[PDB]
Design a protein around this nucleic acid. Sequence first.
DNA 1: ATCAATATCCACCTGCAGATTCTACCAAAAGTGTATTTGGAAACTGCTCCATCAAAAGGCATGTTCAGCGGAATTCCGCTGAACATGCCTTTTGATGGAGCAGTTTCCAAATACACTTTTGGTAGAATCTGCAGGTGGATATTGAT
DNA 2: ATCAATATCCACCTGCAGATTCTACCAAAAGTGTATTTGGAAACTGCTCCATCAAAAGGCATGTTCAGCGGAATTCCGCTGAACATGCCTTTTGATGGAGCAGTTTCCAAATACACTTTTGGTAGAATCTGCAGGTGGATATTGAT
Lengths: 95, 93, 81, 86, 98, 98, 106, 105
Amino acid sequence: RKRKESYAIYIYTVLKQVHPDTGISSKAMSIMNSFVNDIFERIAAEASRLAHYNKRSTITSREIQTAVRLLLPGELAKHAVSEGTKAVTKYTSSK
Amino acid sequence: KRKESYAIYIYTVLKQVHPDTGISSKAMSIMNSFVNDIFERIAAEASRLAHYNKRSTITSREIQTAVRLLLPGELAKHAVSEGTKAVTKYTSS
Amino acid sequence: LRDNIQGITKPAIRRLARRGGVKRISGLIYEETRGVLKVFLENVIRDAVTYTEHAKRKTVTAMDVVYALKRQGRTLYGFGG
Amino acid sequence: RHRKVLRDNIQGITKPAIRRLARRGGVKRISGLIYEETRGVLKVFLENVIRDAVTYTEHAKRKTVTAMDVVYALKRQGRTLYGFGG
Amino acid sequence: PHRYRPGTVALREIRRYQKSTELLIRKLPFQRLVREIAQDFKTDLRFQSSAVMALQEASEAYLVGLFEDTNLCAIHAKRVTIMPKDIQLARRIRGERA
Amino acid sequence: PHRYRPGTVALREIRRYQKSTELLIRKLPFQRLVREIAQDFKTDLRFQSSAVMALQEASEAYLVGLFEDTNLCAIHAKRVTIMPKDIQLARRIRGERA
Amino acid sequence: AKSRSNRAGLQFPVGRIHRLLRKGNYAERVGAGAPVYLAAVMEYLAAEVLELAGNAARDNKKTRIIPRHLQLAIRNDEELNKLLSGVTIAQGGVLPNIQAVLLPKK
Amino acid sequence: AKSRSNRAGLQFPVGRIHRLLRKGNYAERVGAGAPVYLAAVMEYLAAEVLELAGNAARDNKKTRIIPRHLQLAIRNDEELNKLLSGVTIAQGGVLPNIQAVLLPK
DNA sequence: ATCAATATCCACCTGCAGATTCTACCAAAAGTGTATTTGGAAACTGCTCCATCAAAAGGCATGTTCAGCGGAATTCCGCTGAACATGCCTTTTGATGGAGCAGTTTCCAAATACACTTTTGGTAGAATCTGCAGGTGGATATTGAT
DNA sequence: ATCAATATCCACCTGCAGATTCTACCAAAAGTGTATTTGGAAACTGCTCCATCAAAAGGCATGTTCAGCGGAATTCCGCTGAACATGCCTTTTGATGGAGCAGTTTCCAAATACACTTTTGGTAGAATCTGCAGGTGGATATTGAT
């Protein structure tokens, strides 16, 4: 066996939600996979520094939120913050 | 009430190089920032080196490669020698 | 009476240019410079304040500024860190 | 049984290839000395990235430069590259 | 009735300011500007004095460095007088503009 | 005998290349250059084909971006012909020799 | 038994992201909400890019998004262009753009 | 009991550097030699700068190193200048430099 | 402004590489369920040092005058673009030997994890020492007018 | 070339803000001794894929010719900045309540560590599906000569 993970299937699902009849070449999918990973790393590293500067040993949704605000440009930040807060509020309402 | 810094070691190193030279507070603060900046750059590069190669440990070897990646030609050359020498002297005892 | 950005006077701007090796300055430079300085400060201060809020403080520390400058790629030595 | 000495390959970056790159860059007119200056600039860029790429290879104890070694080398230089597993 | 020719004193100023390291913008005015801008992100803020100083050192170092690049752009255009279009070129090429 | 005026075909070329995405440098020659340079740093190295392509995509994006900046420098000096000094000014502002 | 992604109302894998955060040496501890928030942001950014790229593909009368479409989507969008200013997209090319002074006549 | 710094023949704190590497979230483990190597590199770099700054102070007939001196030392050294190209030295000023074309006819 | 030589535009057509779609084995995840550990939010506190106000310090705003810079015009040499002929070397199609990369089972030197002894680095309230920033003086170079 | 108004520089002086020196205090680390755990080097290995030779052919590089027009030197003048003496409004400097930055005690919601149960994303890979590259030709420009 040989297994390597990627966000490809999740990227594909989201593509179908915004453009039901549009496909994506493997190369473009590879670029989308690199993009998602790049975003993950930037936010995580920023959250990491954030926790370190404040002598906190735990990275919570609050550090992720501040990191998003430092990383994204005006409008994207606002919408990212909403989607983020929304997913956490809902995640917390269950179980 | 504490607050750690590299000031005493920087000062001591200063006297080995210039026994008769002093250093102001602001200059000492700059030297401290420099030493911390260097520590962070090297440590972060070694962190990446170990992660890229799926290694759990940061060893003298990661520090060395990071040094070669981060310092310009000659500086790297000497930093590498100084590093190797301290590890050698450390192990030989 | 006045405006804050106008507090950065023509002579102060001239002095900066001088340290920058500039010999002759056109009149339109002053307003262009103020706008550039305003953008520089907005960007760094926005980040500095964001670190402040995250730490639940009401006081902007030198470190908040240092961290903001570092992530803007403007590393500053001499004020901590 | 071996090699075939690699020499002066920087001339492989021809005048026409350079004109094309300048066109994509929106350039309309090119002076005769631009080609040699461009080769020099490309060489410096390549040496710097390759040096770093090869450094990652050696650290991993490999003899084969991977696409990820290049991607990592580009990232160090601030030139993030998308499309090669990075 | 003595009088120095245009450029002579400017050249003298360049030598003087390139030798020194003191801040060239006045403190209070800079302080007011910083507080005004900060007020737009969060109200009722306090500043350690060292915070305002780090901000002034970074700002002045930034403008001086920009004035250097601007000077090269004016000179490139065979001028000795810097203009807004010089500052714009330098910022565009630095990637601060685009 | 028909002939386009100088600059007409160049403009047609700019529109053509700005519209496409293929690599503009020949493949085999670029690969030899990479192997030659790498060899000088370290002998006996091998290369995945994608490693060479990654280097070519990056080198070409780098050069195109440099020519755009160089073009602004030529234009700034009221020319439409880029010269070595425009590339030098651009590299200097970028900090590649600042 | 529900997946954390489902409970969060997300397509992106919360569990995987939680695991990537724990293994990436970012902090000694990672709270349960961190990966939820991060996955939501990642998903939102991917959606925004795909929305724009798909439009670029439609404009070129194509059904399949290719690197060039991703490049046009990103460079024509002010915020994405800034967020991704240090990024190079392979086979993406550049935006058509000819300095005005270069055009003929008057 | 002898300290690790002395054992490695260094002035910089190997024990402190070690602790900083461990708690800085760099990796799950830190080998014994890593802090030794790192400490020595930091020491050497500090030495290099202090030597040049010291000379810059002597050049100005002063016995106390101040920011200006660190700035002159770094910006006049091709390699240190490159290593610190993104750094601003508080109260360092700039190197004396007038473009030739600006000098009197 | 009509003409002619060419490039550009764009919809239609079809072989084909490349993308969407399985049925299934499944290692590796990810989720369920106690048990144990504890990070850091919340309420209360006392000493910093930050904002504010008065008084003394000294840099900036303003109008005049004109030196010389920037840029519009004119001119022409020679560089660089366009076009064409020629043929080379890159590109493409393809199969091969084998170096070397990724995986594997073994297993010891080295690193983690408390628990305990020894000690170095940081600092506050007290003392004292000193490098050098200004301030004076007088010599000399610099600059600009004649 | 000759003064003359000014800036610049060097030697000397000394008050003092800031740096080096001394000491008891002691929490916070760093060094140390024991037992437990494990990352990853060593040796054998299956097969991915990289280096390389093979051969055909046309896309593209090379080199030449010719002249359009861009770059750059030159002259010239309108007006924008530099220099400067004058009048004084703002910044700088030093003293004082209180906002709030840190350290502290507390204890619970939340995060490890862990033994198992359940669901999923990946993928080898024979088979079906399909967007669009690319060859073709004709409608509509776009240029440049006249």
